[PDB]
Each structure stands twice: as structure tokens, then as C-alpha cells.
Amino acid sequence: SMSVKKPKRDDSKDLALCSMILTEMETHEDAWPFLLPVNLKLVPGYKKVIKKPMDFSTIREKLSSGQYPNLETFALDVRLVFDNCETFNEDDSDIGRAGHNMRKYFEKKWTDTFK
Ligand SMILES: CC(=O)c1ccc(O)cc1
């Protein structure tokens, strides 16, 4: 509260660490469904069903241009990619499995790096 400060985590390396994790995700062999925005004019149903589209190249642009206030907002966008994927794809489709694999990969890196 006012003039009563909680001890705060050192956040000075967060930008660099999130960039490193994003690089690891960008180069994973199962990243291919997520590298670019879904083409809303070629993919039936996507525009209407998925209210907040997100993809790795959009996350990279936002990280490079100071649009994440903190590391939690970055993780929210990464998780949005995989949440969208589950909404639109069967668990045992190629894209569906790819999403489950990539979420598992991300969450371990996140835990190992920050938690
Ligand atoms: C990411 C995703 O759900 C998706 C769906 C259909 C595509 O043709 C490409 C990507």
C-alpha cells in the first residue's frame, strides 16, 4: 500500500530471456502452424470463431517494439496461440498435436527460466 513497498523481483533481464525463449520456440520443428498469422481470407471459419488471433511473428514484433509492459503479458500472448489452436483443431490432427507439443515445450522453458 501507500509508502509500504514489497520486495521486488529483479526484472532487468526479462526482455533478453523472453527473446531467447521465443527464439527456441521459433526454431522448433513443430512451430510451422504458428510462425505467421492464419490467413483469414483462405481459412474457412477462423475469422468468426477465433476472436483474438495470435502467432509467433506478431509476438516477436511486439517484443521488439516495447509493446509488452512485463513478462506476464508476454506469456499471456504465447498461451493465446495454443488456446486458439485447441479451440480450432482436433487433438489428434497434425496441427492439434503440434500445439500440445509446443505448449509443453514453452511451459518447461518458462518454469526453468523464471520459477
Ligand atoms: C494455427 C491454426 O490453427 C491453423 C489452422 C489452419 C491452417 O491452415 C493453419 C493454421
Q: Which atom of ligand 1 is nearest to the CA of 50?
A: 3
Nearest to 57 by CA among 47, 65, 46: 65
The closest residue, in CA terms, to atom 8 on ligand 1 is: 43
Q: How far is CA 105 from the centre of its chain?
A: 11
Rounded distance between C-alpha atoms, residue 89 and residue 8, angstroms: 40
Burial of 82 (0-12, 13-18, 19+ CB in 10 A): buried
In the chain the domains, ranked by start, together with CATH numbers, are: 1-115 (1.20.920.10)
Given a contact cutoff of 8 angstroms between Cβ atoms, the answer to whether 98 and 32 are in contact is yes
Residues with a CB atom less than 6 Å from ligand 1: 33-34, 38, 43, 85, 88-89, 95
Among 56, 57, 47, 36, smallest CA distance to 88 is for 47
Give the residue, out of 49, 87, 95, with the most ligand 1 atoms within 8 A of its beta carbon, to mutate for a pocket test.
95
Q: How was this structure determined?
A: X-ray
* Spatial distance between the Cα atoms of 54 and 37, rounded to a whole number of angstroms: 7
Q: How far is Cα 82 from Cα 38, in angstroms, rounded to an integer?
A: 13
DSSP state of 31: G
Amino acid identity for residue 51 in this structure: K
Q: Where are the alpha helices (DSSP H) in 8-50?
A: 14-26, 46-49
Burial zone of 12 (CB within 10 Å; 0-12 exposed, 13-18 middle, 19+ buried): exposed
Instruction: Tell me the structure's resolution in angstroms, rounded to a single decimal.
Output: 1.7
**How far is Cα 21 from Cα 74, in angstroms, rounded to an integer?**
11
